[PDB]
Design a protein around this ligand. Sequence first.
Ligand SMILES: COc1ccc(CC[C@H]2OC(=O)[C@@H]3CCCCN3C(=O)[C@@H](C3CCCCC3)c3cc(OC)c(c(OC)c3)OCCOc3cccc2c3)cc1OC
Length: 126
Amino acid sequence: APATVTEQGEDITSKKDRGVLKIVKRVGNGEETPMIGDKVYVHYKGKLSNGKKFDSSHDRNEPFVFSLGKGQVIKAWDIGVATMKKGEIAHLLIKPEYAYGSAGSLPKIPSNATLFFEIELLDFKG
Ligand SMILES: COc1ccc(CC[C@H]2OC(=O)[C@@H]3CCCCN3C(=O)[C@@H](C3CCCCC3)c3cc(OC)c(c(OC)c3)OCCOc3cccc2c3)cc1OC
């Protein structure tokens, strides 16, 4: 799955340095995508592509909530979720420069960590 994005994934970085690659796995409704400051509701699965940690919001039987484009998540999420429609599910492969960089985030993330996410956008509100 990490390797499929590497092949077919769209580069959605401004720089166009392939730091955030994205495939749509399920198409959402309408055309509308969230705006900066929108409250965003998602389920996700994430892992360290070359690593031994796996996290899912489904574990905690409730959606992950955050405010879009306000630094509250890694760069990739602010860039990635911004491009998603209500009910869309997308896959993201993310180089470390758009995640936790060379520092990582001991304990859960190491240095130079490449991240993969499956994200489902449930809802967003202004
Ligand atoms: C510039 O450096 C940073 C940029 C952003 C952040 C905020 C971390 C943020 O988490 C995330 O952005 C992403 C996507 C949003 C949900 C969870 N996230 C994760 O990366 C997970 C990882 C993803 C798979 C590997 C192991 C768990 C992930 C899950 C985690 O457990 C729920 C987790 C975590 O902490 C680093 C990452 O630790 C608990 C914190 O939960 C939150 C809550 C709000 C936002 C996030 C996590 C910290 C930074 O430095 C440390």
